[PDB]
Amino acid sequence: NYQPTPEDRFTFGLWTVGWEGRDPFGDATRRALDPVESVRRLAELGAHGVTFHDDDLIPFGSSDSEREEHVKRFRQALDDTGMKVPMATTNLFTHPVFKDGGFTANDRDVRRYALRKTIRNIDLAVELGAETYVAWGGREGAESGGAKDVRDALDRMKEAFDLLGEYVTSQGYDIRFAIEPKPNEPRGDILLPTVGHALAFIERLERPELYGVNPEVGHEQMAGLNFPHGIAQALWAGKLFHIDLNGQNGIKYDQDLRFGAGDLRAAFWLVDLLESAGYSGPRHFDFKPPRTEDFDGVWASAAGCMRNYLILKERAAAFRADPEVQEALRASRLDELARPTAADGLQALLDDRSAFEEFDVDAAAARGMAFERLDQLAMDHLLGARG
Amino acid sequence: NYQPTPEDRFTFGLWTVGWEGRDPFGDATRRALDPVESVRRLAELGAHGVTFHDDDLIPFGSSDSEREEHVKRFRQALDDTGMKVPMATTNLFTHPVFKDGGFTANDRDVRRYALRKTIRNIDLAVELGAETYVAWGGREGAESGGAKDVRDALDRMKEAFDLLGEYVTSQGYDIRFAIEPKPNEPRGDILLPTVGHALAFIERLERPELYGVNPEVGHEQMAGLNFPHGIAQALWAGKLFHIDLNGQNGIKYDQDLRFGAGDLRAAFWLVDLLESAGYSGPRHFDFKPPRTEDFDGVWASAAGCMRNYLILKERAAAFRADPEVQEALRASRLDELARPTAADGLQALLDDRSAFEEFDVDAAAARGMAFERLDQLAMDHLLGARG
Amino acid sequence: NYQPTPEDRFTFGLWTVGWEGRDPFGDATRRALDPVESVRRLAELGAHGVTFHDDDLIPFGSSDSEREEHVKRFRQALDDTGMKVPMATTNLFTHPVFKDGGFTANDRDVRRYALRKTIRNIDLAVELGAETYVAWGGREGAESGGAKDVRDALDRMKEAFDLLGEYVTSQGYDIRFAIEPKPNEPRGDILLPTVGHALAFIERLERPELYGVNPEVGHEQMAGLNFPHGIAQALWAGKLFHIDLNGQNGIKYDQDLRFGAGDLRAAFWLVDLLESAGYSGPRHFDFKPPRTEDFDGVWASAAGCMRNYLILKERAAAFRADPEVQEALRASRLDELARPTAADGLQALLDDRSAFEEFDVDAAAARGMAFERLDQLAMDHLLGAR
Amino acid sequence: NYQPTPEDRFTFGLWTVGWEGRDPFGDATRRALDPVESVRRLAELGAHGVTFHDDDLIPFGSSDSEREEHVKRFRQALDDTGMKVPMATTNLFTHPVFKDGGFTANDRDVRRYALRKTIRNIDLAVELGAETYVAWGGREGAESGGAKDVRDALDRMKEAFDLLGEYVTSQGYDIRFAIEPKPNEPRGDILLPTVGHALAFIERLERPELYGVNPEVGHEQMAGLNFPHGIAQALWAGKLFHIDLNGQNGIKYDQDLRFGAGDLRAAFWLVDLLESAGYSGPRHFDFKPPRTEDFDGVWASAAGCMRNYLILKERAAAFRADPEVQEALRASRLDELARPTAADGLQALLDDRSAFEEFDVDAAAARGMAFERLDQLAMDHLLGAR
């Protein structure tokens, strides 16, 4: 079964199911979708809401009159279907003015325009009920070493995020920001390329509590990193404000496959961690239905995102509730991992002969970890051989 | 010429030139070196000092009597040659007791022993004059998802670093810690896999000012990331306490080539940034002379590390001092990148019609960045076609 | 129940369950195993046989008398258990003499010794019944550009494989060779780094029919490549002589995880292709039980390799037999892919206005491929969610 | 001064300096260039010639009258400047009809159209004097495992290349084909992903001598492979028909940086190998001036490609001519690598006690290779630091 409903909090970008299929080497294979169509179709499939870039909802350069009608129609569709808009973002990467960045463009006039375009869309985002405002600095970075002084560009990035935090708190809005890391593409190398670099950058903003991360499965996998481990560090920091779900087959161009495709075992341990941690934000998909597909295949792929989340939710829950797994976690000492190392304190540790002078290093080294039996019980659960 | 002298602050790990050549698939190809030999040979080549793991200087399991003689001989060599010991570290990865980690081992008795082994070596490090104490958590991580709860392991890592900061401040030592990230190898995935993840982890320690990073060229390149950009963010954070220099050819096993080998253009922009920022710490090489070499080739490779740093220092300096490069940096707007975006403040930006309502996005987009001519002047300087 | 039996032809290298857990950053975590114990324990788990490098079965530098004892004990355990030895290989990578290669070492004396050590073990391999003799040139390659002139090295490599073909045919043996590609590690770059470059090199040997490939999951994945695609080109060339199963998580050091770990979807498409094509060789695991494990963990990981192959075999067979999948395969034109483009010939195609002058490119471009529905049926089958 | 002249045989694709800067995340940043302007500007920089896909020179869907005008203007600019057209290719990847491939599309009608569109441009390529016709199967492959049965697809791919060989021989043309490998992008996995798998596939064509490879720096590097090693195996097979020069920084999207950017040491070892082996084909750049640039930046990046090749040519020739390097090459036994292992034959090697029974493995293992000194001489030559 695995039938989604709005309570599962699945959301999708308008640009996701609306991707026309223009790639590096090829023209569009589908016509543009009206956002009304996307909202209604996604609600029929069991989604909870949608998200948008400014330019997905209001064509760039629209008159105020055109802007009003575009927003009216979108809000009309949301109201007719019950869909929500939990997150919004700004396109600071499609227009050629952003070819060397928005907030870190070397041209100061471009950096000022990037912030004005962002602030205008924050007002709309709050009007539509969004709780999170994402920034993906896809054009911040370089192809060559002389072109961007990174410490200057970090100073300009912090300037822009601190001005946006001044604007949201000056207006009394509750919305918070989430930076979405990516390590490369479309620039040779992008600034804040991973969850760890964005977590560290936030600690240098004037009010760090206003900013978190929106990690994307494929973008951490573009650097060969373990996405569940990155999401564990973002949870430990208290900064998982939103998350973007898709698939990726290793280290290559950003594929944005539907969720569950790409690294299926990493998607299992991701859903295991989100549900064990009680993550209560949107389960947001940032995926591209491949350009081989027509519109029926667009909707099939969006459906598959949700389906695979629900299947993996079932299996991770069954693994953690299985008493033989809980016995194997004890044999692997996962319960000792969760106990403090030295709640007795420093002096007690220094005085504890069991910790050094009388520690039998050979007996401790002979103890197996029993990790392989634990992981085969995990595999059995993912494949439904256990329940 | 490019002849190093002690004032260039080049240092080497005892384990570097002392690597016997045992790899995943092969036996040692060289005999072990006595540390005395390594100190004297490196001083003949122009080094400033050496660094050590506890177990490189004192064989594991040594009696106190053996320990005293090993340290006496080492200090004797340092005193005879003028070499210094700026950094030390603990081996928490070779002995089988550390097969599931030191500070984050699931066995709590192992975590306590890891801290006792570390503290004993901090005392020796300070006796020998070290200013930085590095921790490379090579065994912290996992090969499978059930084996390590990452938020529990981060809690145990923070516990251990905060106990070590209690010990150093309780003893009145000036030494500071530097975490050396690596994304994988020998574990499937290692915790704090990049400079950004370690920078973010330090902000959650009780006294973040006691801890920085020791980034290694090849380990950021193992994740496909831009090492100069990572070092720029560590400088911007005020956390470049030490740095490890080597070469790596892309995304593969840790090669530890001599510095300048692997990605030569990244080593040029690395030395450009270290010298432009005024980095005043050790230029430390963590490299393995390939196992094809005999001892003559060990010393040739160590010499090459220093030589290549000095050549690239020359070329980066010449690039930045060349007036045609300085004119090209202006044509590329590197000087506008260094000016605040909106020192006038938020309200002035919102009221500035030149930033949105009257911004000519098409004229700004038509302006070329002139990056390719700048980067070809950089290439000409690296290859000595310009001066 | 997914219980393996010898009929499933699962085999293991002595070096896999016998890995003592020494890595470049750490000492052994397990004692060495007697090959007789490995043979008995693997037979109890359902395996079909074992494979070996010469130096796994006979310690390097053994006397002839010691050699005969080691072999006699091993053959007695094979006989007692019914286990077979389908494949053998030479260790041309542990001993420091091979630090710059065996067959491509720059020292000519070392190239000659590498061939002598291999021919000695081919004799033993045939005495133990092996059908395939693998070569893994893990020390063939370089860390630096001037160290190895690759055209010269490939001449040397072809000379070595041609001599070995001369030896096996001179002796009347039926054994055939299989080259196992790896892109890097332990050398910076290894020669013949993928199944493609090994297949291309075999076509330049004097008798290409004596040589195939032994592709390993993890090694193609270390170059980011699609392992099922490379095994499809090996099968298409008629060169899949043997296969080496394990798991790897992307582009990094060679992990040698148990089969089914690492890229689980690629493991499912590999088993689908092996059973659809009727591959009849050994299903050989080249894996390392992680060094975190004790001996009970070693046998659990070995059991896991076989269990995972049998689960994935069930799931791929259910996918291909499901009528709704067969309908989706037609909807995606997988049956048109299998029809010749132009059996009518060149002139007929040139004269066919339907292929150019009157071809409606827009109508054909509007046709969806329906690959996502197909793939979600495959995911539902893999996860038992139909 | 490193000033290129037409004698250096540097060529550029019309699509390289003419790239308008549209990427998957962004709109064009430059206007389209008239191919006549490109030919005149490249000749002013010292280039030898240009190359083209059919749809670069003639807009897709042009009338015969428009086609003849586009070609006539182009030929007049070639004539005025002295520029040549050594190579041409077909675009079987932009138009949405090719979304699942050209020669391996699951739709048979699309496979037939792909061959018609290619044969039409082979005619034009020969009229413009091309010697090599490249195929880049950038849409041949898949995102998912059930979408493409790779054995079937390779049968289709062989059928297409055999028909094209039939056409060129039927017409008496001297033009030869070169397959350009790429591992991924725009498809999840592309068939024939490296020089190895393209060389292996050509051996299964009906007349392998008509086909070689056109390896591209960046594409092998997208699989982490050593580009000079792959070009050495292409030369060893006698199949380096053409080469495509650019730069790439590791395993990521295809960057197509100017030549000399990306992996500069591998660029030096590539130029060393091309000039040592006497490669005599075009030195063709397949690069994109980054979209940050205006038209002056486009011509600076094109000039840079040629400048970098000429600097690296100087440096590699100085390395190989330096007596101290030649001495270091001997110290590392590069001259023994070039001597046959066993010209004496199999029986002589079996009877040679120096190769086994009396070989002193420890003495030989103690011999350093001296590769680091060698490599530091190469670095000092590359950087002009001797």
Ligand SMILES: C[C@H](O)C[C@](C)(O)CO
């Ligand atoms: C929100 C962000 O802009 C969405 C993109 C474009 O898909 C980047 O992942």
Ligand SMILES: C[C@H](O)C[C@](C)(O)CO
């Ligand atoms: C200091 C650290 O332990 C040194 C290693 C082992 O080379 C890791 O890079």
Ligand SMILES: C[C@H](O)C[C@](C)(O)CO
């Ligand atoms: C047969 C080959 O030697 C086995 C290894 C050592 O595992 C490499 O794959």
Ligand SMILES: C[C@H](O)C[C@](C)(O)CO
């Ligand atoms: C000839 C080939 O089509 C050129 C491309 C498009 O740049 C791919 O490398």
Ligand SMILES: [Mg+2]
């Ligand atoms: Mg995203």
Ligand SMILES: [Mg+2]
């Ligand atoms: Mg290091």
Ligand SMILES: [Mg+2]
């Ligand atoms: Mg193997």
Ligand SMILES: [Mg+2]
């Ligand atoms: Mg190309």
Ligand SMILES: [Mn+2]
């Ligand atoms: Mn993405």
Ligand SMILES: [Mn+2]
């Ligand atoms: Mn390293």
Ligand SMILES: [Mn+2]
């Ligand atoms: Mn392997």
Ligand SMILES: [Mn+2]
């Ligand atoms: Mn390319």
